[PDB]
């Protein structure tokens, strides 16, 4: 999945 701070 995406990292905690991704987007």
């Amino acid at each position: 999945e995406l990292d905690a701070w991704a987007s």
Partner: antibody
Amino acid sequence: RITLKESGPPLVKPTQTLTLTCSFSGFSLSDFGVGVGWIRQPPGKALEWLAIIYSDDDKRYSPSLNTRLTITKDTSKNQVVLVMTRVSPVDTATYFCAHRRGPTTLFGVPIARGPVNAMDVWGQGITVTISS
Amino acid sequence: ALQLTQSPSSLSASVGDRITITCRASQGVTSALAWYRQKPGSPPQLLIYDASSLESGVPSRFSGSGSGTEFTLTISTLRPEDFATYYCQQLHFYPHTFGGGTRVDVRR
């Protein structure tokens, strides 16, 4: 000044459970967005990511080792523990814990996520050998 | 899972040279990439975070660039302490991932 240090048994036998402790200072695990992760390095090999735990208690694990790993934090003792079950010879390695910065904030408002892109401070590493 | 390939795995160099090392991700990781230098018997030391930011207390000869799938770390003027092993790490997707490392030794 942030410092982290790993502690645990230098020798462990196959099928046994390995419990490693990361004791740190210079930061609080209850601080916003901060994280502490574990990385291992088998002799002569590359670094391998194991897991990470954040202040809000969100946990993430290596998919490859997921079933044998547990990570928890003890905010009051400033420690993060990693438990690896059913160890085998292939787990012999140096284990490092490291700090992950949270987003930069301004008057309580996160304004920069750039510093979260790295593990900025590392422990010296603890050598663990797995043999019967 | 996502893969990080470092190039070259091994590199010969002499004091004073300018060297560059590359790290390529199998999928775009935006700018969430860090570079470390590791001396034998010591833990990795953060050099560059977020692809190009210079970590505090790290000497200016180090810099990094790139985004998406291609990244490069360059040491403008190599010093004796740079003979070591370098790693890149991606932190855009879980699990975070390290590259296979690139060894930099004294040329002869």
